[PDB]
Amino acid sequence: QTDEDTGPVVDCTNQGTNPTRDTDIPNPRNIGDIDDRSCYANYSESSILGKFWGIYNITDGSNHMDAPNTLQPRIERSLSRSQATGAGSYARFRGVLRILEVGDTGTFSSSGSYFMQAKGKHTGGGGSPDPAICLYRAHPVYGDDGNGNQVQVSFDIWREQINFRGGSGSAGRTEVFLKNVLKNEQIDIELEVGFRDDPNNPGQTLHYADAKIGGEEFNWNIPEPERGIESGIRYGAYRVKGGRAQFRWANTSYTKDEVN
Numbered sequence: 001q002t003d004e005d006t007g008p009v010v011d012c013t014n015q016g017t018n019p020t021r022d023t024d025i026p027n028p029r030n031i032g033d034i035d036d037r038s039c040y041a042n043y044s045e046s047s048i049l050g051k052f053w054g055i056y057n058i059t060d061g062s063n064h065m066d067a068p069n070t071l072q073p074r075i076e077r078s079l080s081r082s083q084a085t086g087a088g089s090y091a092r093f094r095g096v097l098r099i100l101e102v103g104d105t106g107t108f109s110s111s112g113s114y115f116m117q118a119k120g121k122h123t124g125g126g127g128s129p130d131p132a133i134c135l136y137r138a139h140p141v142y143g144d145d146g147n148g149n150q151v152q153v154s155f156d157i158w159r160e161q162i163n164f165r166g167g168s169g170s171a172g173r174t175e176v177f178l179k180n181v182l183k184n185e186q187i188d189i190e191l192e193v194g195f196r197d198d199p200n201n202p203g204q205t206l207h208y209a210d211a212k213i214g215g216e217e218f219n220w221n222i223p224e225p226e227r228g229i230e231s232g233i234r235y236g237a238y239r240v241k242g243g244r245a246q247f248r249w250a251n252t253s254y255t256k257d258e259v260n
């Protein structure tokens with residue numbers, strides 16, 4: 001039982017050519033507001049492996065929503081941000097992930113695709129007007145398929161993280177390797193982005209993006225916590241600079257708290 005796209009990689013299909021970013025099915029099982037910027041596919045669902053999965057497939061060159069030659073294709077869901085910065089404020093997403101395919105250019109720095117990301121605006125400028133904080137970028141690992149062909153068999157998950165608020169590009173972000181997961185393996189996911197009391201500094205706050213991936217913790221403190229105004233999460237599929245990305249999400253949940 002499989003819900004993998006194996007046809008030719010093309011940039012658009014009729015069934016994926018949505019006219020507005022908010023194109024969704026009735027009563028989606030995945031939580032959050034759809035943001036569909038890929039004419040390759042629309043959000044849909046499968047019933048396999050004993051669960052219901054939101055299907056997020058995108059291909060290189062399929063972004064028909066953003067102005068040309070700007071942002072990568074995506075189909076994501078946005079989650080209401082925690083707009084507070086006191087200790088105890090947080091945004092918390094959970095779900096079950098399967099990775100089936102990710103983008104590949106043959107060069108690491110442009111390969112891989114994001115299945116979720118932490119965002120949050122900050123004071124003082126720097127960066128785009130709604131800048132990312134960190135993204136969870138899955139890179140392909142190849143192996144033989146049993147008939148002599150190299151195919152994607154597993155995925156190295158890296159965190160792409162700002163060096164400073166608003167950072168982007170080679171100087172503005174760093175890649176930290178997290179862990180490998182097999183193709184189609186069901187992975188428990190948690191991402192919590194929030195503010196907590198700084199142990200080393202009585203009155204100060206830390207801004208964190210702490211993930212759990214398949215039972216393992218990958219915690220990280222966001223630079224310049226005093227400039228953050230909020231904590232936000234998005235998930236789905238984003239970025240595909242060559243080829244096709246395929247992510248599957250089940251049993252998603254989201255909660256938040258705003259504490260001043």
Ligand SMILES: [Ca+2]
Nearest residue numbers: 016038041042
């Ligand atoms: Ca679409």
